[PDB]
Amino acid sequence: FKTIKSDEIFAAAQKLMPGGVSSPVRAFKSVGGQPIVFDRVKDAYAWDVDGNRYIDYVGTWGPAICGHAHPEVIEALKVAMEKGTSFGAPCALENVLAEMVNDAVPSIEMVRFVNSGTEACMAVLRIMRAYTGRDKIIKFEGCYHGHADMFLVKAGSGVATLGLPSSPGVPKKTTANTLTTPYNDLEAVKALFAENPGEIAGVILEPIVGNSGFIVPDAGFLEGLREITLEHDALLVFDEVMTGFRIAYGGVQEKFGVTPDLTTLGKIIGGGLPVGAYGGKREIMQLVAPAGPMYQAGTLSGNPLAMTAGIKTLELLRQPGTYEYLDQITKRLSDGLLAIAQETGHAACGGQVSGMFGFFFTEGPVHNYEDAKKSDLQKFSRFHRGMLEQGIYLAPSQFEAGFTSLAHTEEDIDATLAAARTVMSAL
Amino acid sequence: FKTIKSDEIFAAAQKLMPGGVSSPVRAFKSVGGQPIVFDRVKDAYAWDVDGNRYIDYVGTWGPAICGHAHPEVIEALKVAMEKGTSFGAPCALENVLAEMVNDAVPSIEMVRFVNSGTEACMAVLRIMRAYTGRDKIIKFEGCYHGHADMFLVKAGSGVATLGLPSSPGVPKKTTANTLTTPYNDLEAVKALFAENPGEIAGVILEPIVGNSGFIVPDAGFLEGLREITLEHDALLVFDEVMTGFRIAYGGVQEKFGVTPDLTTLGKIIGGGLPVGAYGGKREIMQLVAPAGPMYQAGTLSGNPLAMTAGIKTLELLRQPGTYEYLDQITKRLSDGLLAIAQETGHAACGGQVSGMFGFFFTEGPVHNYEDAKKSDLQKFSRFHRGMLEQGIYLAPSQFEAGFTSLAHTEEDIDATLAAARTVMSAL
Numbered sequence: 001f002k003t004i005k006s007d008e009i010f011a012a013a014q015k016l017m018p019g020g021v022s023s024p025v026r027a028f029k030s031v032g033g034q035p036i037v038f039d040r041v042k043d044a045y046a047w048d049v050d051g052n053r054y055i056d057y058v059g060t061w062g063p064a065i066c067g068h069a070h071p072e073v074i075e076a077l078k079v080a081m082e083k084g085t086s087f088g089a090p091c092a093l094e095n096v097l098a099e100m101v102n103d104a105v106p107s108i109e110m111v112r113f114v115n116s117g118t119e120a121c122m123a124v125l126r127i128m129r130a131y132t133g134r135d136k137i138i139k140f141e142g143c144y145h146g147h148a149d150m151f152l153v154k155a156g157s158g159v160a161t162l163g164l165p166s167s168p169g170v171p172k173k174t175t176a177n178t179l180t181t182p183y184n185d186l187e188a189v190k191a192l193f194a195e196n197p198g199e200i201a202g203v204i205l206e207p208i209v210g211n212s213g214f215i216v217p218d219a220g221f222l223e224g225l226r227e228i229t230l231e232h233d234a235l236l237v238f239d240e241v242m243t244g245f246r247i248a249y250g251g252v253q254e255k256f257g258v259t260p261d262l263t264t265l266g267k268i269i270g271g272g273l274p275v276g277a278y279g280g281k282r283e284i285m286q287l288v289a290p291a292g293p294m295y296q297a298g299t300l301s302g303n304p305l306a307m308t309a310g311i312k313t314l315e316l317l318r319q320p321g322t323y324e325y326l327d328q329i330t331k332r333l334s335d336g337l338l339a340i341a342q343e344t345g346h347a348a349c350g351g352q353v354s355g356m357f358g359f360f361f362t363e364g365p366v367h368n369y370e371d372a373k374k375s376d377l378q379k380f381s382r383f384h385r386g387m388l389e390q391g392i393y394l395a396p397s398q399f400e401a402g403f404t405s406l407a408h409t410e411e412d413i414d415a416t417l418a419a420a421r422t423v424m425s426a427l
Numbered sequence: 428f429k430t431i432k433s434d435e436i437f438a439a440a441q442k443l444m445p446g447g448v449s450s451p452v453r454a455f456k457s458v459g460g461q462p463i464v465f466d467r468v469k470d471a472y473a474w475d476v477d478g479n480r481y482i483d484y485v486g487t488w489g490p491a492i493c494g495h496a497h498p499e500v501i502e503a504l505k506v507a508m509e510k511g512t513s514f515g516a517p518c519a520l521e522n523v524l525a526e527m528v529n530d531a532v533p534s535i536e537m538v539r540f541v542n543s544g545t546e547a548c549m550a551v552l553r554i555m556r557a558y559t560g561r562d563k564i565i566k567f568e569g570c571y572h573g574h575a576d577m578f579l580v581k582a583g584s585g586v587a588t589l590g591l592p593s594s595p596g597v598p599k600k601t602t603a604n605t606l607t608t609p610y611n612d613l614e615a616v617k618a619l620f621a622e623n624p625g626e627i628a629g630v631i632l633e634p635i636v637g638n639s640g641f642i643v644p645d646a647g648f649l650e651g652l653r654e655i656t657l658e659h660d661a662l663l664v665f666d667e668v669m670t671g672f673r674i675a676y677g678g679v680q681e682k683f684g685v686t687p688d689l690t691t692l693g694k695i696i697g698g699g700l701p702v703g704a705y706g707g708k709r710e711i712m713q714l715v716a717p718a719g720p721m722y723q724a725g726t727l728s729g730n731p732l733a734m735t736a737g738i739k740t741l742e743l744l745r746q747p748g749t750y751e752y753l754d755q756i757t758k759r760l761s762d763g764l765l766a767i768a769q770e771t772g773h774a775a776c777g778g779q780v781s782g783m784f785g786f787f788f789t790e791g792p793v794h795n796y797e798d799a800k801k802s803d804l805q806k807f808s809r810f811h812r813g814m815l816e817q818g819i820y821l822a823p824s825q826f827e828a829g830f831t832s833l834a835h836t837e838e839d840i841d842a843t844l845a846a847a848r849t850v851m852s853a854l
């Protein structure tokens with residue numbers, strides 16, 4: 001298993017960029033510190049800069065649900081760029097994607113496109129407060145919604161990995177307006193409102209957690225949150241940047257039947273390009289400039305390329321049996337991995353919902369970030385490296401959910417289980 | 428002059444998106460309210476969804492310095508997307524653009540790519556504090572650095588144009604750490620440090636303002652800022668999202684010889700795609716995760732398409748006589764506009780530096796936001812509409828700088844002056 005070229009490039013990268021990466025998790029710090037540099041991706045595969053081919057379960061962290069470099073998406077992009085990649089003015093495509101998104105997401109009646117999940121979260125945090133006139137926000141430990149100053153507290157992703165809580169970087173004051181609670185803990189939340197009457201603008205959370213490993217909400221959790229927010233005139237915000245269009249066309253809110261007031265979207269909506277979006281009830285979205293006083297802008301927001309990619313992606317997802325196929329191959333994968341773990345004598349737990357799955361090296365079950373942290377990271381590290389050598393690319397972190405795509409075939413799944421058996425047989 | 432199609436689309440957009448736009452300024456609020464929907468752009472022109480053709484001076488707000496849909500850029504993109512548009516893992520292209528950026532920008536020794544100017548400014552605000560251990564920041568009235576909460580104080584760009592106050596939704600606790608001072612007012616700045624000993628993390632500003640109309644720094648302003656920051660161990664941050672690669676390959680810092688500690692980049696660096704970047708002294712950048720404790724991530728950061736576009740764009744800018752040409756045609760434009768104003772009896776002032784210019788309907792001179800506000804917005808509105816009808820597309824705002832590109836020809840300039848003469852002769 002040669003990684004000579006990846007090592008060269010990554011070594012050089014570290015001299016040009018912090019940690020030699022554009023994003024923390026890519027440094028493979030939580031799993032050995034030896035990242036592989038991709039050269040190209042297609043369908044369900046990724047190719048090393050060394051020629052190694054992998055069955056990819058990261059899907060560029062969510063966007064590639066239709067498979068990498070989907071023929072129809074690239075062709076649509078090839079045609080659209082002939083007209084220019086950015087206008088700085090309205091374009092008909094913004095209207096199209098906007099309509100598609102409104103129809104697809106229950107809670108969304110009005111949408112504002114931005115360039116990333118981070119911008120969307122940042123913006124949604126602002127109207128939550130702008131709309132309610134309150135400053136406190138409730139977020140859960142292990143959840144990740146981008147980074148900022150008064151919000152980066154016990155976040156997920158690169159944060160909920162090395163035990164990193166909040167900051168550094170933000171002032172020891174801003175975060176005071178951000179309340180934290182354990183995921184799946186309704187009581188903790190009620191306690192927070194009880195302790196801050198008329199001060200909570202709302203609760204934001206990943207309807208299904210993907211940034212502290214894969215964690216599904218316990219029965220009644222989402223419903224409880226919806227009920228309590230309504231009770232205290234607080235907003236319920238679903239960060240579906242990762243779950244949106246993956247768990248279901250309408251996301252977790254559609255799947256589990258709970259409608260938030262505001263929703264953030266990203267990844268898939270961009271079909272591979274930088275795109276974010278936030279929308280919700282019209283009355284709330286009305287405060288967004290130029291319609292309302294809350295300012296939020298973006299030079300490249302709604303650019304024709306991103307819109308084209310998003311539109312083509314959503315169109316592909318609307319085809320028959322899309323989510324059934326994802327659930328089918330992912331359950332197979334998820335169950336298979338767990339069986340192999342049982343068979344090989346390794347304590348493990350996990351689950352999957354549509355093309356999103358999780359696998360922890362702990363008997364669990366995992367209901368929150370604290371549970372997730374009991375996972376044997378040492379073993380995960382060896383497992384991840386072992387799978388890599390077997391040609392399987394998994395999230396270089398125990399705290400990141402895995403992803404499946406419409407391009408993954410039954411054979412890819414079997415090849416992955418064969419690889420998993422081989423790897424866990426060792427460990 | 429028909430705009431039937433634009434009106435239809437914009438009317439529909441307002442029902443789907445706040446103000447029917449992805450970004451405030453595009454709404455034409457302060458210039459007529461009838462924005463025009465672009466269909467395509469090419470070279471120095473833009474085409475209405477109604478068939479109207481315009482000589483574009485907005486350049487999608489900065490990115491299109493090489494001209495819209497530059498052949499070499501679109502071809503590079505066509506080839507790159509065959510390999511996929513996003514990896515979610517390191518790619519060789521990140522190293523390439525990173526190296527190019529480090530070489531181009533004096534202050535930048537290490538870079539972190541992000542997806543927008545907003546993310547770059549947001550991130551840079553965070554290490555300023557992380558690095559100095561101080562919470563207060565100094566920004567100038569009229570300057571715009573994205574919509575990160577801390578920056579929504581006396582903001583320019585869309586806030587100014589829309590006559591919006593400091594945006595709501597941002598906790599007083601957070602805005603309290605943003606200290607403001609009029610641009611070009613060194614004394615006000617010194618007073619701020621004097622009043623907040625050991626509390627100022629640094630000063631951030633547009634080396635050359637473009638978001639409160641075009642405003643150049645008075646002699647000694649930038650130098651003074653550099654000196655005072657050094658004196659109080661505070662950081663000097665240049666937001667060159669707009670000026671970067673436009674005023675000069677190395678930006679204003681290169682042109683005017685003043686080196687900041689951190690620099691934010693955007694627009695042009697993305698060559699038409701969503702891209703942002705922040706870099707500066709290595710010792711400061713070292714705090715950025717995964718190298719340091721300050722967390723900042725981005726799913727699509729450093730994606731291969733953006734990198735490709737940025738690389739090709741920078742390569743074109745490195746060609747001989749690039750900036751000489753921009754200065755040449757823009758001075759011609761700037762002077763011409765002023766002569767016509769004089770000739771037609773309209774009070775006016777403005778200026779240009781490279782492919783960036785400004786034109787105010789006020790005798791001025793304009794040294795700061797307060798001066799800029801003295802402009803006759805009524806007249807500007809009529810002027811802008813009049814030019815539009817003559818086939819010239821200008822920023823729909825008196826408070827936004829205008830832009831020139833390598834695709835604009837001497838003839839385009841003359842046609843613009845001819846149009847200008849015609850329009851101002853009326854008014």
Ligand SMILES: Cc1ncc(COP(=O)(O)O)c(CNc2cccc(C(=O)O)c2)c1O
Pocket residue numbers: 023024025026061116117118119121144145146157158206210211239240241242266267400724725726727
């Ligand atoms: C639930 C959730 N909300 C917001 C974001 C942010 O969108 P952007 O990243 O486009 O600003 C996420 C991100 N999901 C995610 C997961 C793992 C790594 C990374 C990484 O930045 O390298 C990102 C997320 O998972």
Ligand SMILES: Cc1ncc(COP(=O)(O)O)c(CNc2cccc(C(=O)O)c2)c1O
Pocket residue numbers: 297298299300450451452453488542543544545546548571572573574584585633637638666667668669670693694703827
């Ligand atoms: C100096 C400066 N700094 C930061 C930004 C922000 O980058 P993004 O806009 O990529 O988030 C700018 C923006 N410049 C600008 C000017 C006019 C329109 C718009 C608009 O959002 O519609 C943006 C800017 O001009």
